[PDB]
Amino acid sequence: EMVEANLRLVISIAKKYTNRGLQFLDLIQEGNIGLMKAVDKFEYRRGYKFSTYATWWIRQAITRSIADQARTIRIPVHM
DNA sequence: TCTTTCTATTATGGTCATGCTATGGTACATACATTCACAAATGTATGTAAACGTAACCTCTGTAAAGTCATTAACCTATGGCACGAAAAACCAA
Question: Which of A 18-77 have CB under 7 A of nucleic chain B?
Answer without folding.
Answer: 19-21, 56, 59-60, 63, 66
